[PDB]
Design a binder for this molecule. Structure first.
Ligand code: MG
Ligand code: MG
Ligand code: MG
Ligand code: MG
Ligand code: NA
Ligand code: NA
Ligand code: NA
Ligand code: NA
Ligand code: NA
Ligand code: NA
Lengths: 1015, 1015
């Protein structure tokens, strides 16, 4: 019958014989074990070694398999995705569905996973009560057999499916058989931008409950106006036979102290003309001066729910963690415990590079620590309900959660083709309701979300009202259909810009500042997705946070996203490398669009991460005279684990420094008086750096953790002294093909046909492998490329503007090249013009001055044609012969920084190994820049001026021709790029031009100067 | 798989392979036929003779039935209910489920109907296009096979279920097999107070459409401030292969005149980031000064939707009737076309005494004509979507409709057990959504309803918002959970009273005047059920209408209900009788509670109908001197078919009459002067009577139809003349046992032991069969009985208060009986005491004065113990010897009227046959009373005074002992009851006391006088 019905091609059938959803159960038979959240004997794990066989379709599955293990089958770990074991390929597609769009049908070649397990069941579990099996995650649909008999069917990859096995088991050995289909009618609602995989990827377990049992329970907390009194309200439901002797007790614990308690018989209030719920009871407990829950201080109580007899004999007990907090919207502001929130959030998919989409505790804890260490306070479950342990961990560590239902239909045309169709309402409702029924008691969950990218349909409206009706404690949001529909309490756009309107038809993304004050609008605005962190990204990030602070109704957003979705492949010699879309034969695919993280697959930080930490600081600073003003952005806590370190330095050289304790109230101010500063000996700029240090370790950080910092310029003494004139005078040697200059053990050569410095000698040794030439291009970033491909060009992306304008193909034509001997120097003058098909793009005019002391002063003036696309950079490059261990500079650092992403960097003297001067982005591009530099040292070379640079073993050319980082090979010597000017990187999104006007190189005339010498 | 799946015990499966729901289609291939609504060749009826066999379960059905006709099966007529043909019993239950409550399961003994049909299909339908089958109604679930192969499955008994037969049909003979189950998981949502039947009870048809087709269309009409401009908006959706040459044209017609037109290609406006619906188009037509639709004047246009090509080739045509009207709630008022409605409504089930739940045109038309003739302007579809033809007739004749979803869970405990469970959301949503998708283009449908008596659950909220999202042109209403929840735009209580609060816990029925002004309340109030019309009922009906008129926000209600649900059975002689609950072996049952109508099952009126007509009049009246002031309650029309008849009479005798045209604007007044009336000579009371008459016939009434009336007392001249002094004197004859009085041929006898008038003689004929005695009781009405039964007594009911107090068993004790001889008369004086168990209930003191003219003046004074329950009446009864043909009276008439139901009756001189003085209620009770009577004539007898009376061949004893009207037999002679005072009949409901305080007999001391003579 099962192969005849094809329930996996019927959106009217989403389960068969499946049990009702509920909060996490353990069925404790002792109240103390429940209180302390220790393991339960009534909850067994079935994870471990199972039997597995792969089939191309469900028609290919032999009928013997229902009763006998297949000898052809293998032994594999569960939980797992079968693509991670090599049985078939994982696919990466973004918008376009991985199957033909023909609802409700799927392909006839539908890969099939046959899992089986032989296991023991104890006699005690069968004599009394109810034994159930629980599958936490099966992708995407499945049929279940026990001892050869059919049990039932289930869909939705991301929520538990449970079945009663009481009538099916025997004492001793038992056999489970699970048939997992890769594709089903459920797939039409699971079109998230991620790897498409399948199998049993979350926990399997077995739970024993009594016959008379707790079948559901709800906890609520409401408050008086000043939060000095609370009422905890708990509604409990039972199953089994109803008797007068039955009782529930809900008791509230704080550590080992019981603070409140209530006991009552079953039989709720009268509800209508037919009475009340005889199988339900409500308990109300008064709590005076409750400790409140927030992400700043995650205060938790333990609630224990006991079903028992009047006389006091336990039947069973459940329990959960309780956080006393209020979430409400008033006067256009989202409030937590009466104060306006500021969301420092991120989006987080469940991803591991080795295990695929299987989640474990070690990884989850690793993620939460990094988040909190980097000033984040909120997370979005993009875009499905998470592993149940996630919520418990957020409750305990302190993070605000947006729990989101497993619905995305991005690939339909138009986007709401299913979500407006009443025949898809049943399948949709189950994905929203079963989420709310499971997670409604977690305090970390503050907002419900209806899914993502499914346009706006009437089904969203019904399900919105359903949530508001069953759970008034929490606001509901939904971005689809323009981000401000009747199905959202919060304006929640994706990738809307700070100042810039993007007036798309029907679904415009307004500037967030403008969006608030549209006629009739009153709601708060929090971006569900912003600052697309693909590759070298996060430009313009400070612009959001400046707006967030100034505008009360702008309350933050969630960065896209946390972690790169790369996977590990192995080569011939057995070495691992990071792979993205296409790398498995998967076609069509969306290549590297699956890598948008602030961290790599293995949780190493991208440079963008430090920019997020600095801008998301909790302390704000102002300087007046000798006075630092410190302001706190905390809403509830004092600065009880904070001190201020201050230091003053003269061009990197330390002069004075000290410490002061921080004692600031939430929203308060503290004025710190700096002592009399000693007077500086010499020329240079004085800088002040402050940083907030945490002396004591926490649950989430180490002793000495740095949480905030800020810099200021102090007094400047400009250099007014002439370097006393030297004895020596440089000598010029004119040839037809070269101008050569000599001074002691140093030699310079200017080629008279190319017009550039072709070689330079210290003593006798060659310093250059390539001539010193102008450069107006960069190895293109992901933001520069957008969705542009070889076979389908988008002419609007920056890379295509540059290609079509000939910027990459342009050839330097020499206009002028003269030499003159002066009293104490030699002066070389050059001029070049870069042309493409008869159009002059660039003109570069230079003078090189070599004086008696071996210093070379280079002066550059560039003209750029007003009607060419603004250049990526204006600077110089060369390949040095020398390979040295260390790079030393006086400028912004120590990490990678660009003009629109440099606020986190500080001015000082930095020193790193060469390999650190390279950011290993999986898709290679321009990387490693440092800005605002006054001095650079590498080997015996020193450059001075006011410039930006990168230094590495990889040419811009290798970087732009190579697609995977592991395919790069180090070149002879070190490629040096020194720019007078560099274009911003943008990243408000990664599919259209996103570099803001004030970071484009549009001035038409540019000037910079540099001194090159030996040290 | 069909027997193994058991899809009828699974609320997660409500259909298999069923096509989407849609507005009435006919697939016309000629535009002129679509416009004129003439028959289509592409829509065949399959109604007529089919084959049928009955089984006790689906397991008992032979497999040969799929392949071949069963020799044992009978030929029967479809549509029908198989209970109406005798195959099993119909069941009457009100609240309690007809099956054991154990969701989702049904009994293993499940009466199965096996239907089959052999039919031919036109050759062309096989070559190309799509052939579907439509079942408008199947009760309650079914499986379908064509030519032995399985097609699909269907639930919901009240909306059409459609299937594609294209891959199934063949040349020549085809056979349909339809397996119909009585019970399903669908029955849990179908617990309406009604007979429970089964089968194929609505139409069956075949529809042939092109492969490229119209699959959906919506029509909407919106207006400017004063309705002088309209825009008609029509959205159209297609199925099949998209071609650039395709087009849609929507044209609007009034008769043969095209008023507006619009044409466009497919491809709607951009909706989201993925574009728009390429398979859809939206047309907008301008209409200046549109004829507006209302129930007063049902102005209709015709819209024709053509799917064609660019060069003018038609593919197919659909169509509908369009009414230009706006429905909105503003400032707490329900407005139609800017004006506040006053709903004169009624609930109506689909019921026929012979054919059960099968509807036909003739019965439908008959129903509508009788409603309009009685001043009803609105109907409620209790409690499911009706036969499609009903909405077409309502559009055309003009009645406001409340379309109701087929959801009632009355029998659950608590009432919302299912409707609050997310696992019942899918089954529920299909009942709401598929109603709306079908009926949204009907103009007569002004309000959507979510069902009835299912409590208030979160599923109601979700479906409330769904309707408001897809159709904002109509308010949504729902009564469950207290009548004023968040799932209704209208306060819509059932049986809430005018002045009296009933503060039930959780779900109080506040008095309707009070309900309006509760703190925070702003909504309009229209009762969804009021004035329960069970048996002798509708007392206090005037009180509702007075308040409807004084309070702008009380906008009317729907009477419960239209027609008695009695069925026809046949006895031993084959003579018909009216049957109710229990008479088919059906048990448990709710007896006569299925009979609640204003009309009998055959559409003969109850007396209550005329009271509805009068209180619901559209013209109000005031008299001031010679001035009659007429006011119109019409909102839209002038009195263009209305004249006023006036007449003045002196104690029934005509003195003057006239006619005046009526020309009153909507909400207008008109003053009409009376000519000065000729002076009346003799004593008496003058009465003015006015009626409004329609001189011309309409679509719903004949010429001469009376639509409104009113009466006033004018001048009274009190009688002062002495009667003619008679010359004879009455003689007394005493014995120990009797006082006899004699005058001429006349003779009176008084029993000195009982104390009553025991016999009277006119010459030598006895006039009495039973002595003249006080009576304080009545054969209890349904309102008297309530839910009280022999096996479960309700002590609070009036009949039980009377039974327990001994009213029915009280025996008369004689206290005093004397005779005196005066100058010209004989005086008899009596005193009686009625006692029960040593307690005195009533005392009656009488005098009888028999004088020289032969007249007998009876004076009566009664005491009623304040602590006894107030009596049903204070009067006299006796059984007269004579049986006569006519009854003639001066008083309120001509129909049955009671003290709290007599506003419709007029004071005049009435003359009827004796049988019209008896109302044949199916469950017999007190009936046929007439109030305000000053003179009664019957045979040679005449009674003068100021009394209430009823006259018949049936004693109060027989009426109370007999349960069915057909089991009554005429008694010898005639039973007369003459009351001085009679209690009200009540009727606000029929399950608690409902007679208002001022219509109960509580004065304690009563007085009345009669004169009995032979005229
Ligand atoms: Mg399915
Ligand atoms: Mg997407
Ligand atoms: Mg079913
Ligand atoms: Mg009911
Ligand atoms: Na803000
Ligand atoms: Na992505
Ligand atoms: Na590259
Ligand atoms: Na009113
Ligand atoms: Na009834
Ligand atoms: Na009776």
């Amino acid at each position: 019958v099962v192969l005849q019905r094809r329930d996996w091609e019927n959106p009217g059938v989403t389960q068969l014989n499946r049990l009702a959803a509920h909060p996490p159960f353990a069925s404790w038979r002792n109240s103390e074990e429940a209180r302390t959240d220790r393991p339960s004997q009534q909850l067994r794990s079935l994870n471990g070694e199972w039997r597995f066989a792969w089939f191309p379709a469900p028609e290919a599955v032999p009928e013997s398999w229902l009763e006998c293990d297949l000898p052809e089958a293998d032994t594999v770990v569960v939980p797992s995705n079968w693509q991670m074991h090599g049985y078939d390929a994982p696919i990466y597609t973004n918008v376009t569905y991985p199957i033909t769009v023909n609802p409700p049908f799927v392909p006839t070649e539908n890969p099939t996973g046959c899992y089986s397990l032989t296991f023991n069941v104890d006699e005690s579990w069968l004599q009394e009560g109810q034994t159930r099996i629980i599958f936490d995650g099966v992708n995407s649909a499945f049929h279940l057999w026990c001892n050869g008999r059919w049990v039932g069917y289930g869909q939705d990859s991301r929520l538990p499916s449970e079945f009663d096995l009481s009538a099916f088991l025997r004492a001793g050995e038992n056999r489970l058989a699970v048939m997992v289909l890769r594709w089903s009618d459920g797939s039409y609602l699971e079109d998230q931008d991620m790897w498409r995989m399948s199998g049993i990827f979350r926990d399997v377990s077995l739970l024993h409950k009594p016959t008379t049992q707790i079948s559901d329970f709800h906890v609520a907390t409401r408050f008086n106006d000043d939060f000095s009194r609370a009422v905890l309200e708990a509604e409990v439901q039972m199953c089994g036979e109803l008797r007068d002797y039955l009782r529930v007790t809900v008791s509230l614990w704080q550590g080992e102290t019981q603070v409140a308690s209530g006991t009552a018989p079953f039989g709720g209030e009268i509800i209508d003309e037919r009475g009340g719920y005889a199988d339900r009871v409500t308990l109300r407990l008064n709590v005076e001066n409750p400790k409140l829950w927030s992400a700043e201080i995650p205060n938790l109580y333990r609630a224990v729910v006991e079903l028992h007899t009047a006389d006091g004999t336990l039947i069973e007990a459940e329990a959960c963690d309780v956080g006393f907090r209020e979430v409400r919207i008033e006067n256009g502001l989202l409030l937590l415990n009466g104060k306006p929130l500021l969301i420092r959030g991120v989006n987080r998919h469940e991803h591991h590079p080795l295990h695929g989409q299987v989640m474990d505790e070690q990884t989850m804890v690793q993620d939460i620590l990094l988040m909190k260490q980097n000033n984040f306070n909120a997370v979005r479950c993009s875009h499905y309900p998470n592993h149940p342990l996630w919520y418990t961990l957020c409750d305990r560590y302190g993070l605000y959660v947006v729990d989101e239902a497993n619905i995305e239909t991005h690939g339909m045309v138009p986007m709401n083709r299913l979500t407006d169709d009443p025949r898809w309402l049943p399948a949709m409702s189950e994905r929203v309701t079963r989420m709310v029924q499971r997670d409604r008691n977690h305090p970390s969950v503050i907002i419900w979300s209806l899914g993502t990218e499914s346009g706006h349909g009437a089904n969203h409206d019904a399900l919105y009202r359903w949530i508001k009706s069953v759970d008034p404690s929490r606001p509901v949001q939904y971005e689809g259909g323009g981000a401000d529909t009747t199905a959202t309490d919060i304006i929640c756009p994706m990738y809307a810009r700070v100042d810039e309107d993007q007036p798309f038809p029907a679904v415009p993304k307004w500037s967030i500042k403008k969006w608030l004050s549209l006629p009739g609008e009153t709601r708060p605005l929090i971006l569900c997705e912003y600052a697309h962190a693909m590759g070298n990204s996060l430009g313009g990030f400070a612009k959001y946070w400046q707006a967030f602070r100034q505008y009360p109704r702008l309350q933050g957003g969630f960065v896209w996203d946390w972690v790169d979705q790369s996977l590990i492949k192995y080569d011939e010699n057995g070495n691992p490398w990071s792979a993205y879309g296409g790398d498995f034969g998967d076609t069509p695919n969306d290549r590297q669009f699956c890598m948008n993280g602030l961290v790599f697959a293995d949780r190493t930080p991208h440079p963008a991460l430090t920019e997020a930490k600095h801008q998301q600081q909790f302390f704000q600073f102002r300087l007046s005279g000798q006075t630092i003003e410190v302001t706190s952005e905390y809403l509830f806590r004092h600065s009880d684990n904070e001190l201020l370190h201050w230091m003053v330095a003269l061009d990197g050289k330390p002069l004075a420094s000290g410490e002061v304790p921080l004692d600031v109230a939430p929203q308060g101010k503290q004025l710190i008086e700096l002592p009399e500063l000693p007077q500086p000996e010499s020329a240079g700029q004085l800088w002040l750096t402050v940083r907030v240090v945490q002396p004591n370790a926490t649950a989430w950080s180490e002793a000495g953790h740095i949480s905030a910092w800020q810099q200021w310029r102090l007094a400047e003494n400009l250099s007014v002294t002439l370097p006393a004139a030297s004895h020596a005078i440089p000598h010029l040697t004119t040839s037809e093909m070269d101008f050569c200059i000599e001074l002691g053990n140093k030699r310079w050569q200017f080629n008279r046909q190319s017009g550039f410095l072709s070689q330079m000698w210290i003593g006798d040794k060659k310093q250059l492998l390539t001539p010193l030439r102008d450069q107006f291009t960069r190895a293109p970033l992901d933001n520069d490329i957008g969705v542009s491909e070889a076979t389908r060009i988008d002419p609007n992306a920056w890379v295509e503007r540059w290609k079509a304008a000939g910027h990459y193909q342009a050839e330097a034509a020499l206009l002028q090249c003269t030499a003159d001997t002066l009293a104490d120097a030699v002066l070389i003058t050059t001029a070049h013009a870069w042309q493409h098909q008869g159009k002059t793009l660039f003109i570069s005019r230079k003078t090189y001055r070599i004086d008696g002391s071996g210093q070379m002063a280079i002066t550059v003036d560039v003209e750029v044609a007003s009607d060419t696309p603004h250049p990526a950079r204006i600077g110089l490059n060369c390949q040095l012969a020398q390979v040295a261990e260390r790079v030393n500079w006086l400028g912004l650092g120590p990490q990678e920084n660009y003009p629109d992403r440099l606020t986190a960097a500080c001015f000082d003297r930095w020193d790193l190994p060469l390999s650190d001067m390279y950011t290993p982005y999986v898709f290679p591009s321009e990387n490693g820049l440092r800005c605002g530099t006054r001095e650079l040292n590498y080997g015996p070379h020193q450059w001075r001026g006011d410039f930006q640079f990168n230094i590495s073993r990889y040419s811009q050319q290798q970087l732009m021709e190579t697609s995977h980082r592991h395919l790069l090979h180090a070149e002879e010597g070190t490629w040096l790029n020194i720019d007078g000017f560099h274009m911003g990187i943008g990243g408000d999104d990664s599919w259209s031009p996103s570099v803001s006007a004030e970071f484009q190189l549009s001035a038409g005339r540019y000037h910079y100067q540099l001194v090159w010498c030996q040290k």
